[PDB]
Amino acid sequence: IVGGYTCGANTVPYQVSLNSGYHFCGGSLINSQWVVSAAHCYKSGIQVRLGEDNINVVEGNEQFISASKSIVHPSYNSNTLNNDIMLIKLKSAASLNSRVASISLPTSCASAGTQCLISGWGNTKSSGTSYPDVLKCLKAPILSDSSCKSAYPGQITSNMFCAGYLEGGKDSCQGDSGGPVVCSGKLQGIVSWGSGCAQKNKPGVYTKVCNYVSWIKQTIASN
Ligand SMILES: COc1cccc(CN)c1
Numbered sequence: 001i002v003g004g005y006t007c008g009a010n011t012v013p014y015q016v017s018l019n020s021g022y023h024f025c026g027g028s029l030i031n032s033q034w035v036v037s038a039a040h041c042y043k044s045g046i047q048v049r050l051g052e053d054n055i056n057v058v059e060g061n062e063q064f065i066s067a068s069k070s071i072v073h074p075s076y077n078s079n080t081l082n083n084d085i086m087l088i089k090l091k092s093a094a095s096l097n098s099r100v101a102s103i104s105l106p107t108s109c110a111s112a113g114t115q116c117l118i119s120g121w122g123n124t125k126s127s128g129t130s131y132p133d134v135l136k137c138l139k140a141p142i143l144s145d146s147s148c149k150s151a152y153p154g155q156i157t158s159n160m161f162c163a164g165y166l167e168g169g170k171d172s173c174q175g176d177s178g179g180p181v182v183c184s185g186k187l188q189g190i191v192s193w194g195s196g197c198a199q200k201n202k203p204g205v206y207t208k209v210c211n212y213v214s215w216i217k218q219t220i221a222s223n
């Protein structure tokens, strides 16, 4: 997260860290046994880490649970990043509490202008590399489809939305991938892509979660 703020320990209880020996992506806990992330975060050997603040120190609220299976969206295209969504099942159910909690799926799609919360442990510089160890947060509005398409000609599908600031300075970044965009207590987006981070006229692009609720529910119900 570039240009954000320190969230505060366990203030984003649905935020998870995906760890394969090291943090590589975020995700969102959507019930006691399932996480939603980006398809471009797919890899084998994933441990889901819940209740994290400092991802480098055991602070006492963590639950470390290995993934039993991953399910990438059947229509995911890694070139265009269309359908950039993946489900991850935990080997055992997380113990839910105030600091480890699921985030509800959307009943409706959020409109342009809606204020959302984007979070993650990604790079905090738009040119440097500095990785924070504590969770970072950014409040950002969803941008209009027209402005999003104008920012990225030929690349924005109906399964994507832009959020952030055309002026730059505030954005998600590398390592935030797969993490949540939450608006009014619902998961509306997944950190997906962009051109660099926090650059003028290149806002973050996010997977449009409301298009996938049926797939998510059916997949969970049979797996
Ligand atoms: C180019 O690396 C990125 C990874 C995730 C999200 C974003 C959005 N600025 C950029």
Ligand SMILES: [Ca+2]
Pocket: 052, 053, 054, 055, 056, 057, 058, 059, 062
């Ligand atoms: Ca920790």
